[PDB]
Amino acid sequence: VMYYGKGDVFAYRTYLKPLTGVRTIPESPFSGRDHILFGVNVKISVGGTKLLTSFTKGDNSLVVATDSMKNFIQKHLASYTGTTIEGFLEYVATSFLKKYSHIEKISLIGEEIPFETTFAVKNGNRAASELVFKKSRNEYATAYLNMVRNEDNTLNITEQQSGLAGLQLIKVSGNSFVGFIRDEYTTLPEDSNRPLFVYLNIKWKYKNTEDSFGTNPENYVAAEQIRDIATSVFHETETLSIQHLIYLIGRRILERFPQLQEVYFESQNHTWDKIVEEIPESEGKVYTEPRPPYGFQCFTVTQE
Amino acid sequence: VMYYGKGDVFAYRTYLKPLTGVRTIPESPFSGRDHILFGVNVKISVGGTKLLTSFTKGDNSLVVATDSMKNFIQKHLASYTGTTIEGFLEYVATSFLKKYSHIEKISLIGEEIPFETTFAVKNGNRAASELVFKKSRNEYATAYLNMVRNEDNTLNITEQQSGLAGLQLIKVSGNSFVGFIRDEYTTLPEDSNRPLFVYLNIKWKYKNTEDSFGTNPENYVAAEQIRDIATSVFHETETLSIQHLIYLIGRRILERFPQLQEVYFESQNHTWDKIVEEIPESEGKVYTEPRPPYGFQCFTVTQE
Amino acid sequence: VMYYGKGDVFAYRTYLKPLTGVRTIPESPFSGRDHILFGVNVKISVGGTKLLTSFTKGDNSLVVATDSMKNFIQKHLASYTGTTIEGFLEYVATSFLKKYSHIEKISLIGEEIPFETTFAVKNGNRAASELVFKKSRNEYATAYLNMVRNEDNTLNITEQQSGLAGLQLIKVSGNSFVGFIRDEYTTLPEDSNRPLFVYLNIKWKYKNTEDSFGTNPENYVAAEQIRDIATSVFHETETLSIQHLIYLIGRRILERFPQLQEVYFESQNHTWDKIVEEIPESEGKVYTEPRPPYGFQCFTVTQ
Amino acid sequence: VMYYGKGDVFAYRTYLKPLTGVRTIPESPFSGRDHILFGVNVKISVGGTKLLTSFTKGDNSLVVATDSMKNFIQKHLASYTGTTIEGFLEYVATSFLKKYSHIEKISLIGEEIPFETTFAVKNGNRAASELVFKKSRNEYATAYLNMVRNEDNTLNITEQQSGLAGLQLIKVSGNSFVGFIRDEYTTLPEDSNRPLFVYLNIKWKYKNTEDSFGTNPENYVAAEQIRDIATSVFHETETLSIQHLIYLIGRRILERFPQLQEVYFESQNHTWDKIVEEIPESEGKVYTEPRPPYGFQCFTVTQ
Ligand SMILES: O=c1[nH]c(=O)c2nn[nH]c2[nH]1
Ligand SMILES: O=c1[nH]c(=O)c2nn[nH]c2[nH]1
Ligand SMILES: O=c1[nH]c(=O)c2nn[nH]c2[nH]1
Ligand SMILES: O=c1[nH]c(=O)c2nn[nH]c2[nH]1
Ligand SMILES: [K+]
Ligand SMILES: [K+]
């Protein structure tokens, strides 16, 4: 292996072109993005056979400084005329390979830095502010792109993936975990009604990479829509396990977005431990945080 | 000093009595709390002269185990019939001093563990779920209560404070920082239009402790309402500094809630560094994260 | 309350004057610091009645920018000719009040950013490198100082405290927790031999603030020495609780350092849950991490 | 992809069999581990075609609960008679596949939870305590293993890697970064003498997986030895970049350990920004923390 690059390249852009013209689904009100404020955290990795002597001999002649990669990304966010993180990565990648002909491969990650709207009173009414936003440390969209230079100096995308990370969902009832193996290693009781708490990271891959860019926005799959599918399916389903839930989420995603080829889940179980099972004159209960060990699941659903 | 206790006592309750009957303000739609899910992280500290030998001699005779304090808190969340974190702390404190007559002082912190609503489709329409909620790692309500046992075995509250913590607000324009001291230590340029990014922790104290409990909910001051005041005032104000902003927020809080005696702010400056000042054919700009050092302000506004 | 300032002012200096000739105690090999690399994270807070209009009116006329306070701290680390964090804070505080006559109060915290030695082969044998150091995320020294301007324009230190933060110690055996209250709320079993795991933050105050500066190193109390007292006392003591342990650590500190007036402890309990009590043909056991709730204690011992 | 498992399975064992008799290298004093306290954080992942319906149908008939995998790991730390994390993973993997015939693949990660010795006064002199240890949040050893069941029902290790994570090293002088591309995107100045601060994660693969287990300790490669090679090489080398440094560390590792097939590096640059270039009557400088963006390098050296 031989790569180098820059991580935590934060870049915040005001007044990116808005995303509109999207295709709606039943599970989501999502209709676009205003883009008054657009934040992204970028990681860039580059490789190429001609970088070998930068390691073996300390020869920096063909080294693009990682600080210069940071400048490149931040300057390109200023000149980007598109509407998605996916399209921003394509713009950076193509531009970088065109600039540096000795680079054979570039890999990019972009993570949304999300902001939410806030309320303000003016002119006699309360409305969402066009100026003041709230930083969110909850779920966020992601994008991944890898591009190569071939022998003829043409460029090709070699992998693209979009995602939603950091979704944390708890369903207070309507979940069971029963019927698992009971042997000399089993101390977990069967539970016909648990408050399942799952962390979800969901990633999708398009059949046609062009649909990821937003240039024809009706073919874009928005992380907001994926989020809303996940919450709807969790609500709708008497869950039998996390494994069962994520399969059903993935099936719904692929049904709503026929332009997707596959969806990949990384899930974790953070369900609370029960303290009080019955409260006089109430349907409530009390729970608390478990010990650190967490279950996890990794699963792909494909159109096939 | 001589105290001991338990921290990170997480407790999650389903179906707490809902908070309703609140008094509204122009800046906020807030109208109550459903309390389908109510999470709190509690810290308890206790003291008393009769605990001295637990330190000086290793005599545990009068030691309530900190693990038992955890049980006490979690069991009392199950039996709590009120509607606020403030009232929950009062219930725990009074109950604990009544149980343990050798304890002279108790201090409690409760921090909300907030959950947000999610969307689900059922019966032909999309609506907010009554079952599936999203864990929020953004701003959260707080409460503080200290109670003492006097010589006659009567109990008194000796300090109460409510709060909002973890609010992170960025205003993209309409903020200046000019006119500060320019001497041999000054390298900061004057800036007539910066994207001010502030972290806010806001705490308030009631004139009458009873109003904090929710028993007559029209006198309660909700953290949600305080949040919405903060965002409105930030939007409304051409800010001249963070100091200027927080004074104005505090004045608005005290005007809207005459039952409050004072409000206290801890603010931090996290404003981004500018990278690109002018973009062809756009009003946008690009910014990035600053170096670690952060400014901060601590300020009290009183009805007087 | 009316204050403002700057936090997370990191400042690293190479080749600070070495601290040498500190009086040793039996529990610790410490006698000084080479200061090839000296790192500190500073927080500065300032107040004064003349700052009122910066809040009430948005008037920045008397505002020293917090960015300028960062420059002030960093430049003063370059000009500091002393040997301790405590003395550096005094130098910053005195200098700032002398510079800015409208400021009536300054509070400073300094937190060591610690670096440990590493091995390098020099002339065929391993020795400590004089160039390569390892950044440590374990325990670190601390210092606090509050200085005011009086009505007669003299400057006065009103509060000083030094400390050791982030010490995490686990003693595998030789600890009990028995005899506590057993009532309706008690589920914890008594334990005559637990692997007590404590986090310790230890703070001390000097009788004479000048001793904190290091100018006469013989009277300086080093956080490294406090660390080694804590480990020695934990080892020597069949503990009966954390409360019992911290009292005994405090007494030993005050006995070793008669120039101190007080020692203050903030401790937390992080003892593991036992999973396997007996292993064939072994004295060992298996444990795991507990649920999140943690006990804590706060206690002052005075000289 | 179709896998599931358990993460953050902490397990602490007292009095694991000591690791002794490891062949030493010049850069390191390491020859063994006392194992009075042995901590590991384990992650387990399992797969098999017979798990399909647990996802597609909600059928838990063939689901080993992830909670039960936690019990399995913790009980096997109690019964483990060997001396290394690598060997513990092999024991868990073999045992799990032998127990659960429907599982075709198991992947394990083990991360050391390191504890350092402390001083106690014993018979009038400081010595290392045999009871009191300090939890370290610095560098730690790692191990990875993937084992499969073949069609003929033999079990086979398909991947093994050991490592050292979290090493943070700063060399105050004797580092340059010059000669890189200067074009429209370049603002970084050349620097002939920077205080290079690197984070290093170093991973190695053995030619013969058995050598990783420690059964013949003479062939075991200890993370402590890798650490000390890295510090020695950093000290000895006038570095020309991180890229140059990690290549040289890798070559030294492979020279010292002919039983290794490869070494893999993940490095990050955290070098401070210079604030004060010259201090009167001193060789020292002042630096501060940079903005967040960090450089990184990934590189394999092969035997
Ligand atoms: O949904 C779950 N899947 C599992 O595999 C599991 N194991 N323990 N609890 C569990 N819950
Ligand atoms: O609002 C601000 N207040 C300050 O005190 C300050 N100092 N630097 N920047 C600043 N911004
Ligand atoms: O040392 C201890 N002190 C306490 O107060 C306590 N409570 N539970 N366990 C404890 N251990
Ligand atoms: O050692 C370094 N390698 C790099 O690639 C680099 N880029 N900026 N600074 C750097 N330092
Ligand atoms: K819709
Ligand atoms: K309203």
Short mmCIF file of N, CA, C and O in Angstrom, two decimals, chain D residues 240-292:
data_model
loop_
_atom_site.label_atom_id
_atom_site.label_comp_id
_atom_site.label_asym_id
_atom_site.label_seq_id
_atom_site.Cartn_x
_atom_site.Cartn_y
_atom_site.Cartn_z
N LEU D 240 13.24 13.69 6.44
CA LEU D 240 12.99 14.52 5.27
C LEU D 240 11.51 14.66 4.96
O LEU D 240 11.14 15.47 4.10
N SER D 241 10.67 13.87 5.64
CA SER D 241 9.22 13.86 5.56
C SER D 241 8.80 12.73 6.48
O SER D 241 9.63 11.93 6.92
N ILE D 242 7.51 12.68 6.77
CA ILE D 242 6.97 11.52 7.46
C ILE D 242 7.15 10.27 6.60
O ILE D 242 7.46 9.18 7.10
N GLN D 243 6.87 10.40 5.30
CA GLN D 243 7.01 9.30 4.36
C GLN D 243 8.39 8.66 4.48
O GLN D 243 8.51 7.43 4.55
N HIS D 244 9.43 9.49 4.57
CA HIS D 244 10.81 9.04 4.65
C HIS D 244 11.04 8.33 5.98
O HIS D 244 11.69 7.27 6.04
N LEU D 245 10.51 8.91 7.05
CA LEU D 245 10.65 8.35 8.39
C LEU D 245 10.03 6.96 8.48
O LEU D 245 10.66 6.02 8.97
N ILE D 246 8.79 6.81 8.02
CA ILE D 246 8.11 5.53 8.21
C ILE D 246 8.77 4.44 7.38
O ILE D 246 8.84 3.27 7.82
N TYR D 247 9.26 4.76 6.18
CA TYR D 247 10.04 3.78 5.43
C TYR D 247 11.22 3.29 6.26
O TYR D 247 11.47 2.09 6.35
N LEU D 248 11.97 4.21 6.86
CA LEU D 248 13.15 3.80 7.62
C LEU D 248 12.78 3.01 8.87
O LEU D 248 13.49 2.06 9.23
N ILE D 249 11.70 3.38 9.56
CA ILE D 249 11.24 2.56 10.69
C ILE D 249 10.91 1.15 10.21
O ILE D 249 11.31 0.14 10.83
N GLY D 250 10.19 1.05 9.09
CA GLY D 250 9.80 -0.24 8.57
C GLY D 250 11.00 -1.12 8.24
O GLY D 250 11.02 -2.30 8.57
N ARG D 251 12.00 -0.55 7.59
CA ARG D 251 13.21 -1.31 7.27
C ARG D 251 13.90 -1.83 8.52
O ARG D 251 14.35 -2.98 8.54
N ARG D 252 14.00 -1.00 9.57
CA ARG D 252 14.63 -1.45 10.81
C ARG D 252 13.84 -2.57 11.46
O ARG D 252 14.43 -3.56 11.91
N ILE D 253 12.50 -2.46 11.48
CA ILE D 253 11.68 -3.54 12.03
C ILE D 253 11.96 -4.85 11.30
O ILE D 253 12.18 -5.91 11.93
N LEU D 254 11.96 -4.81 9.97
CA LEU D 254 12.14 -6.04 9.20
C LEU D 254 13.55 -6.60 9.36
O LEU D 254 13.74 -7.83 9.31
N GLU D 255 14.55 -5.73 9.55
CA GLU D 255 15.89 -6.21 9.80
C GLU D 255 16.00 -6.88 11.16
O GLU D 255 16.69 -7.90 11.29
N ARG D 256 15.32 -6.33 12.17
CA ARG D 256 15.40 -6.89 13.52
C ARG D 256 14.60 -8.17 13.64
O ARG D 256 14.95 -9.04 14.45
N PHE D 257 13.56 -8.32 12.82
CA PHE D 257 12.63 -9.43 12.93
C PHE D 257 12.49 -10.11 11.57
O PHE D 257 11.52 -9.89 10.84
N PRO D 258 13.45 -10.98 11.22
CA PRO D 258 13.38 -11.66 9.92
C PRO D 258 12.17 -12.56 9.77
O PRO D 258 11.84 -12.94 8.64
N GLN D 259 11.53 -12.93 10.87
CA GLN D 259 10.32 -13.74 10.82
C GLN D 259 9.10 -12.96 10.35
O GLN D 259 8.05 -13.57 10.11
N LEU D 260 9.19 -11.63 10.24
CA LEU D 260 8.07 -10.85 9.73
C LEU D 260 8.09 -10.79 8.21
O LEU D 260 9.15 -10.75 7.58
N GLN D 261 6.89 -10.78 7.63
CA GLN D 261 6.74 -10.63 6.19
C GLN D 261 6.51 -9.19 5.78
O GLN D 261 6.99 -8.77 4.72
N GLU D 262 5.85 -8.42 6.62
CA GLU D 262 5.52 -7.06 6.22
C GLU D 262 5.25 -6.21 7.45
O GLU D 262 4.89 -6.71 8.53
N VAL D 263 5.40 -4.90 7.26
CA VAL D 263 5.02 -3.90 8.24
C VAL D 263 4.22 -2.83 7.51
O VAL D 263 4.60 -2.41 6.41
N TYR D 264 3.12 -2.41 8.12
CA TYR D 264 2.20 -1.44 7.54
C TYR D 264 2.04 -0.26 8.49
O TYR D 264 1.82 -0.45 9.69
N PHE D 265 2.12 0.96 7.94
CA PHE D 265 2.06 2.18 8.72
C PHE D 265 0.85 3.00 8.34
O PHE D 265 0.53 3.16 7.15
N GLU D 266 0.21 3.54 9.35
CA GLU D 266 -0.73 4.65 9.19
C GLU D 266 -0.22 5.77 10.09
O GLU D 266 -0.20 5.63 11.32
N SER D 267 0.22 6.88 9.50
CA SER D 267 0.77 8.00 10.24
C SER D 267 -0.08 9.25 10.02
O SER D 267 -0.79 9.38 9.01
N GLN D 268 -0.01 10.17 10.98
CA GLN D 268 -0.65 11.47 10.85
C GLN D 268 0.32 12.53 11.30
O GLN D 268 1.12 12.31 12.23
N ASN D 269 0.24 13.69 10.66
CA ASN D 269 1.04 14.86 10.99
C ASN D 269 0.24 15.82 11.86
O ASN D 269 -0.83 16.27 11.45
N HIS D 270 0.78 16.13 13.04
CA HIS D 270 0.19 17.04 14.01
C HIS D 270 1.19 18.12 14.45
O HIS D 270 1.06 18.67 15.56
N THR D 271 2.17 18.46 13.58
CA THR D 271 3.21 19.42 13.90
C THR D 271 2.62 20.79 14.23
O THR D 271 1.73 21.30 13.55
N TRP D 272 3.13 21.37 15.32
CA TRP D 272 2.66 22.66 15.79
C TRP D 272 3.07 23.80 14.86
O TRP D 272 4.10 23.74 14.16
N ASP D 273 2.27 24.87 14.89
CA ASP D 273 2.63 26.11 14.22
C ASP D 273 3.62 26.90 15.08
O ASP D 273 3.43 27.04 16.29
N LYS D 274 4.65 27.46 14.45
CA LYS D 274 5.63 28.26 15.19
C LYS D 274 5.09 29.67 15.41
O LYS D 274 4.57 30.30 14.49
N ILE D 275 5.25 30.16 16.63
CA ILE D 275 4.79 31.49 17.06
C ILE D 275 5.97 32.42 17.27
O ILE D 275 5.95 33.58 16.83
N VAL D 276 7.00 31.96 17.98
CA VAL D 276 8.17 32.77 18.29
C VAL D 276 9.40 32.04 17.77
O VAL D 276 9.73 30.95 18.26
N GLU D 277 10.10 32.64 16.80
CA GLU D 277 11.24 31.98 16.16
C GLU D 277 12.53 32.16 16.94
O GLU D 277 13.44 31.31 16.83
N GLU D 278 12.68 33.23 17.71
CA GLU D 278 13.94 33.50 18.38
C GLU D 278 13.64 34.03 19.77
O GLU D 278 12.80 34.92 19.93
N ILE D 279 14.33 33.49 20.77
CA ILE D 279 14.25 33.95 22.15
C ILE D 279 15.62 34.41 22.57
O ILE D 279 16.59 33.64 22.47
N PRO D 280 15.79 35.64 23.08
CA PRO D 280 17.12 36.11 23.48
C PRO D 280 17.82 35.15 24.42
O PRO D 280 17.22 34.63 25.37
N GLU D 281 19.10 34.91 24.15
CA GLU D 281 19.97 34.10 25.00
C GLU D 281 19.49 32.66 25.15
O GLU D 281 19.83 32.00 26.14
N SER D 282 18.71 32.16 24.20
CA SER D 282 18.18 30.81 24.27
C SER D 282 18.13 30.20 22.88
O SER D 282 18.04 30.90 21.87
N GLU D 283 18.16 28.87 22.85
CA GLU D 283 17.94 28.11 21.62
C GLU D 283 16.47 27.77 21.42
O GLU D 283 16.11 27.20 20.38
N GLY D 284 15.60 28.15 22.35
CA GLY D 284 14.22 27.71 22.32
C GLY D 284 13.32 28.58 21.46
O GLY D 284 13.67 29.72 21.08
N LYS D 285 12.15 28.03 21.20
CA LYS D 285 11.12 28.67 20.41
C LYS D 285 9.78 28.45 21.12
O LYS D 285 9.68 27.62 22.03
N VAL D 286 8.73 29.13 20.65
CA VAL D 286 7.37 28.86 21.11
C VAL D 286 6.48 28.48 19.94
O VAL D 286 6.55 29.10 18.87
N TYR D 287 5.63 27.48 20.15
CA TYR D 287 4.74 26.94 19.14
C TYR D 287 3.34 26.84 19.73
O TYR D 287 3.14 26.97 20.94
N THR D 288 2.36 26.61 18.87
CA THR D 288 0.98 26.38 19.32
C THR D 288 0.28 25.37 18.42
O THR D 288 0.80 24.94 17.39
N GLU D 289 -0.91 24.96 18.84
CA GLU D 289 -1.68 23.98 18.10
C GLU D 289 -2.10 24.51 16.73
O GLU D 289 -2.47 25.69 16.59
N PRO D 290 -2.07 23.67 15.69
CA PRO D 290 -2.52 24.08 14.36
C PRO D 290 -4.05 24.08 14.25
O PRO D 290 -4.77 23.68 15.16
N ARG D 291 -4.54 24.50 13.09
CA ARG D 291 -5.94 24.26 12.73
C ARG D 291 -6.15 22.75 12.55
O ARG D 291 -5.19 21.98 12.43
N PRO D 292 -7.40 22.30 12.48
CA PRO D 292 -7.68 20.86 12.54
C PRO D 292 -7.13 20.02 11.39
O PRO D 292 -6.84 18.84 11.63
#
